[PDB]
């Protein structure tokens with residue numbers, strides 16, 4: 001009970017799902033890879049680990065057999081029935097890397113959605129990845145079957161309709177924008193419940209109610225996602241921009257940014273654009289007095305003249321106690337914690353808006369070589 005066509009092999013017993021016009025997909029094999037095999041009546045390279053691969057096509061006297069990179073599940077399955085080593089941020093990163101690659105090839109997906117973002121079978125290293133695919137897979141009620149289609153609409157894909165209702169790359173960034181929130185909110189949409197999304201979208205009526213206003217990780221996510229789903233397409237950042245966002249930075253890269261703008265400043269004028277732009281609106285960020293809001297053993301060690309309401313001075317202080325982290329009393333090293341992880345969290349947990357504030361403020365130096373890893377050109 002095993003059909004062999006060319007390099008493609010499969011067992012007819014193993015049906016993975018069904019499509020249109022007698023289209024079937026089987027669990028199969030190719031080049032010793034576990035692949036999906038779509039047998040179809042015939043109609044009339046530059047790859048990336050995060051776009052689904054189309055390996056091989058083979059024909060008999062009737063059908064065409066296409067070998068597709070096999071997936072373990074659907075993103076909507078990952079997010080909803082969350083009983084699944086790979087974390088949500090890395091998932092989104094891989095997805096954006098795929099999407100950025102497609103965009104470099106002047107390709108636009110037009111229908112990016114949780115059913116389109118596939119979860120790979122674990123490779124030989126036990127690693128799992130995100131895969132952007134043409135066809136979305138859908139909940140069938142059996143074991144184990146799936147619906148596949150390359151169309152928006154179709155049951156049950158509603159709630160995720162092609163935002164084009166000539167498309168530019170901005171329809172994709174908008175789509176991903178919703179997926180980002182879909183993943184972070186563990187299964188909610190930025191424009192509300194299914195029936196009202198279309199109405200809310202067309203009016204830009206979004207609500208990121210899962211992103212707490214005073215929590216650093218949520219604040220950072222909100223900044224990006226808001227811009228991604230911007231009502232005006234021309235306020236939306238390219239896929240490469242999204243990759244540069246602090247949303248994806250490691251705790252080390254975060255702290256390094258902080259230290260970078262700090263170093264960039266200490267010779268600035270306090271009257272000039274750079275520092276003034278950084279201080280505008282910075283009292284809520286610093287919490288009026290940031291010496292009032294850090295742990296007791298630390299403000300004792302500062303007792304230097306840092307302006308308690310100045311963002312610049314806060315950043316300057318963070319820099320010094322990192323540059324002198326070895327020369328510090330053991331009391332203030334254990335309150336600051338390790339470097340950089342505990343160290344940068346020492347502040348961002350207390351000053352939830354510091355990074356996002358400093359990030360947007362320091363766009364005045366985005367064109368500089370110092371801030372190349374933090375901004376896109």
Ligand SMILES: CC(C)Nc1cc(Cl)nn2c(-c3ccc4n[nH]cc4c3)cnc12
Pocket residue numbers: 016017018025036038052068069070071072073133134135137144145146147148
């Ligand atoms: C074991 C299940 C969860 N894996 C898959 C089931 C189905 Cl129905 N399709 N599929 C694909 C797939 C991916 C792309 C396709 N284009 N046309 C048909 C396609 C099928 C990849 N991994 C699976």
